[PDB]
Amino acid sequence: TSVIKIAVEPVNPSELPKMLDGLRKVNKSYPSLTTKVEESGEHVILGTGELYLDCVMHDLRKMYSEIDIKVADPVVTFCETVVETSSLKCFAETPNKKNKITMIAEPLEKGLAEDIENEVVQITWNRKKLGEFFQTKYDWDLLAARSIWAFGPDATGPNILVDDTLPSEVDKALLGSVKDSIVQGFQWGTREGPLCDELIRNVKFKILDAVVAQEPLHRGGGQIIPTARRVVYSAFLMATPRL
Amino acid sequence: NTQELLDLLVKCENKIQTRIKIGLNSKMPSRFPPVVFYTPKELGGLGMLSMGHVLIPQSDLRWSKQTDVGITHFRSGMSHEEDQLIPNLYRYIQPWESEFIDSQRVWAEYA
Amino acid sequence: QWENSFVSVYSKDNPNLLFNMCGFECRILPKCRTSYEEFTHKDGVWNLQNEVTKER
Amino acid sequence: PFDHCSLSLQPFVYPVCTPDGIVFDLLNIVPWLKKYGTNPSNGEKLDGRSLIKLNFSKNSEGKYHCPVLFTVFTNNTHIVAVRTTGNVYAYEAVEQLNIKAKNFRDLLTDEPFSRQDIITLQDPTN
Amino acid sequence: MYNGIGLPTPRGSGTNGYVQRNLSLVPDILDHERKRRVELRCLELEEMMEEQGYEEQQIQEKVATFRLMLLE
Amino acid sequence: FRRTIYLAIQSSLDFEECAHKLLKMEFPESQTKELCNMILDCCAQQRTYEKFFGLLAGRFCMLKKEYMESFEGIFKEQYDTIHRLETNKLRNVAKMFAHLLYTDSLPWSVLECIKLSEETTTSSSRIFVKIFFQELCEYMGLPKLNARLKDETLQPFFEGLLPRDNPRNTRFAINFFTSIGLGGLTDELREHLKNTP
Amino acid sequence: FEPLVRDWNEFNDINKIIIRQPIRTEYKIAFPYLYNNLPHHVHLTWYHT
């Protein structure tokens, strides 16, 4: 797990393109040293350990680029989560007021998120296998397994977007229309974090009210995703942030 | 409150002492303990008044030029022969802000 | 001349008013403004007092 | 900064951006063109019908955010604009939602868009 | 430890530069999930019916009461 | 001892450096209370009040409880032997305890030893508490002075100062709060005494 | 030894830092390049013998 955070700058901003050449060369010469040009305008590096980062900057200042460069102090990359279920709802409706989405949030258990990380629950299965896995091990509902749509951040993200509101759920025309954008916005909110722009982990969101504009056309199709992630944030921030 | 004076006064006081040593012909630190400089002039000494035997309070350069951090360490002032505790002129002078209140009350009640 | 002079503003961004008189270098900071934290400490700090209400 | 005029270098209550990228507060840019037809961003005179209006969204705080992402737009956030629709959605929003896909439509409405109709109006990384 | 305290060099300073530390320092929510209660109420009923017979009329019997007798 | 203490004091520049010098010498743990009472003695005999000595013995109190309870007794004892000085010494004494109080080094509890009856109050005590409370209000501002002098959790101590029980010393002590000019406290409690009969 | 050679910064902003354990010269010498800007004429000595 790469966890250490190091921001770097040249002393005179003039030679920043050369500093960029150097950060290229280290990124190419190192396996998992990961650099990012962060929205604050900065250049952050994410790494493993003290000796690791030491020899990193040793080569950076020694060989690749010979500018003088300032270096901030080490810090961590963070995670976000909840402690208990979103006791109420804020529900987001598209810019053109066409789709009302009610969803809430709560905590999963650690183990199943661990399995999500283990690739043990690979949804590359059929929903049937999903159900076997889930109900078998952790007394999940079979219908909860039917309700699990996806996993958030990326291929392996420890949170789960679930859809459980039966009579409006059998609107498989409009919902089975909207699942794609729904998942886009979900993984959006999960990756970009509701509080501090770091990853969320091990959290369960449940869709309980999908009032879809009939023919959820490009109006929905386009103006649906920020609405979805705002639903995500509403649930989370409403009833219980945690670090 | 000026941490740059305190250093100025240490260095300047000990330059004056050193010119007296150089006036005799040696700077050995044990030929000239403090006693010969600070003894009053009745007992034959020279009669110096000192402010360089204080401890100079030191604090964390970086945040010292940033946000008034406090006092963590104490550099030493001039070097005195033992513990020896040499007094201070500042403690025998009386601050202004307190003289201004005295004078307030004193002339009020004389009026 | 602007080179030998010195101007100091107090506003909603500067809570300190700095000036430089007979030989002293002074800086006034009110209590209402950004002093959540106040001490009474070494003497370098005169505690000015408002002579109508008599409160510092 | 973000939402202030440039010739006045003061705030604009109603904006009209330049087809080049800055904020030309129409109320005084029309005085500037009706008294000396040139532009302050570029001392060369520039035609009239190019000064289109702009849409800076607003939250429960009223701040000139981006509507799509709900992202408050200040001097750090990258802001693109869509000319033909009349709406401005955040540059990152428009980029990852249309420069990944091939639906080059509008960012607030159901309208298509032209692959060059989006111009950078505010970007501290440029 | 030279912890950013002291002199660079106590050479031309008139002191030995010795340092020390200051010793005196110190509303749909229930209704949305009610249909979810009603959900498995129809599901497992026809399951516990198919466990005891899957003619789909014996189980549509079991579900309809589990739907109507509950929703009353 | 007192020689070495007076000399560390008179050789330092502020209570920080003096406290460092004292703790860097060492003594037996026996004389802690008299450490505090000694800084007391020295300031009492000073030219004029300067919060040096206050801040110093108060810092000792901050560094251990010995001087906290020691100062419980120290205030007690200056209330016992406060007539013993002249007006000058008594002024610095009152300003001393006042610095203690608004720095909260002494607890506002100690007011129990302050019985505001006429016949119990030496004129010396009267002037002492006069300068004391003027220092408190002109230090803290009057509002939170009224607020804390109001909160009931301390009224057990404060009773001796604010008489409702005995009406004679009610008249007297409220007239004294009138005297020092804290009309708020004065008229609030003689309001209650208005309502009483 | 005598020192070898002889305004504003943002990383030193005191509002953005978290001091959970305070840096010391032992760290600044253990990791010369991580814990020090402009580390010049430096030997990086380490031993896990």
Curated annotation (Swiss-Prot), chain A:
Subunit structure: Component of the U5 snRNP and the U4/U6-U5 tri-snRNP complex, a building block of the spliceosome. The U4/U6-U5 tri-snRNP complex is composed of the U4, U6 and U5 snRNAs and at least PRPF3, PRPF4, PRPF6, PRPF8, PRPF31, SNRNP200, TXNL4A, SNRNP40, DDX23, CD2BP2, PPIH, SNU13, EFTUD2, SART1 and USP39. Component of the pre-catalytic, catalytic and post-catalytic spliceosome complexes. Component of the minor spliceosome, which splices U12-type introns. Within this complex, interacts with CRIPT. Interacts with ERBB4 and PRPF8. Interacts with PIH1D1.
Family per similarity comment: Belongs to the TRAFAC class translation factor GTPase superfamily. Classic translation factor GTPase family. EF-G/EF-2 subfamily.
Clinical note on disease: Mandibulofacial dysostosis with microcephaly: A rare syndrome characterized by progressive microcephaly, midface and malar hypoplasia, micrognathia, microtia, dysplastic ears, preauricular skin tags, significant developmental delay, and speech delay. Many patients have major sequelae, including choanal atresia that results in respiratory difficulties, conductive hearing loss, and cleft palate.
Domain of life, source organism: Eukaryota
Localization terms from the record: Nucleus
Entire protein: shown range: 585 to 827 of 972
Record's protein name: 116 kDa U5 small nuclear ribonucleoprotein component
Swiss-Prot record, chain D:
GO BP field: mRNA processing; protein folding; protein localization to plasma membrane; protein polyubiquitination; RNA splicing
Family: Belongs to the cyclophilin-type PPIase family. PPIL2 subfamily.
Purpose: Has a ubiquitin-protein ligase activity acting as an E3 ubiquitin protein ligase or as an ubiquitin-ubiquitin ligase promoting elongation of ubiquitin chains on substrates. By mediating 'Lys-48'-linked polyubiquitination of proteins could target them for proteasomal degradation. May also function as a chaperone, playing a role in transport to the cell membrane of BSG/Basigin for instance. Probable inactive PPIase with no peptidyl-prolyl cis-trans isomerase activity. As a component of the minor spliceosome, involved in the splicing of U12-type introns in pre-mRNAs.
Location(s), subcellular: Nucleus
Residues of the full protein shown: 38 to 163 of 520
GO cellular component: catalytic step 2 spliceosome; cytoplasm; Golgi lumen; nucleoplasm; nucleus; plasma membrane
Subunit structure: Component of the minor spliceosome, which splices U12-type introns. Within this complex, interacts with PRPF8/PRP8, EFTUD2/SNU114 and PLRG1. Interacts with isoform 2 of BSG. Interacts (via the PPIase cyclophilin-type domain) with CRNKL1; they may form a trimeric complex with HSP90.
Species in which this protein is naturally found: Homo sapiens
Primary localisation category: nucleus
Gene it is expressed from: PPIL2
The protein's name in its UniProt record: RING-type E3 ubiquitin-protein ligase PPIL2
Domain (U-box): residue spans on this chain: 1-71
Signal peptide (residue range): none
Organism domain of life: Eukaryota
Curated annotation (Swiss-Prot), chain E:
Underlying gene: SRRM2
Compartments it resides in: Nucleus; Nucleus speckle
Record function comment: Required for pre-mRNA splicing as component of the spliceosome. As a component of the minor spliceosome, involved in the splicing of U12-type introns in pre-mRNAs.
The family this protein is said to belong to: Belongs to the CWC21 family.
Disease in which the protein is involved: Intellectual developmental disorder, autosomal dominant 72: An autosomal dominant disorder characterized by mild developmental delay and intellectual disability, predominant speech delay, autistic or attention deficit-hyperactivity disorder features, overfriendliness, generalized hypotonia, overweight, and dysmorphic facial features.
Miscellaneous section: Can functionally substitute for CWC12 in yeast.
Domain of life: Eukaryota
Subunit details: Component of pre-catalytic, catalytic and post-catalytic spliceosome complexes. Found in a pre-mRNA splicing complex with SFRS4, SFRS5, SNRP70, SNRPA1, SRRM1 and SRRM2. Component of the minor spliceosome, which splices U12-type introns. Interacts with DHX8. Interacts with CACTIN.
Name this polypeptide is given: Serine/arginine repetitive matrix protein 2
Tissue expression summary: Expressed in liver, placenta, and white blood cells.
Modified residues (N-acetylmethionine): M1
Coiled coil: 32-64
From Swiss-Prot, chain G:
Organs and tissues of expression: Widely expressed.
Domain of life, per lineage: Eukaryota
Cellular localization per UniProt: Nucleus; Nucleus speckle
Record text about domains: The MPN (JAB/Mov34) domain mediates interaction with TSSC4 and SNRNP200. Has structural similarity with deubiquitinating enzymes, but lacks the residues that would bind the catalytic metal ion.
Job of this protein: Plays a role in pre-mRNA splicing as core component of precatalytic, catalytic and postcatalytic spliceosomal complexes, both of the predominant U2-type spliceosome and the minor U12-type spliceosome. Functions as a scaffold that mediates the ordered assembly of spliceosomal proteins and snRNAs. Required for the assembly of the U4/U6-U5 tri-snRNP complex, a building block of the spliceosome. Functions as a scaffold that positions spliceosomal U2, U5 and U6 snRNAs at splice sites on pre-mRNA substrates, so that splicing can occur. Interacts with both the 5' and the 3' splice site.
Protein name: Pre-mRNA-processing-splicing factor 8
Organism: Homo sapiens
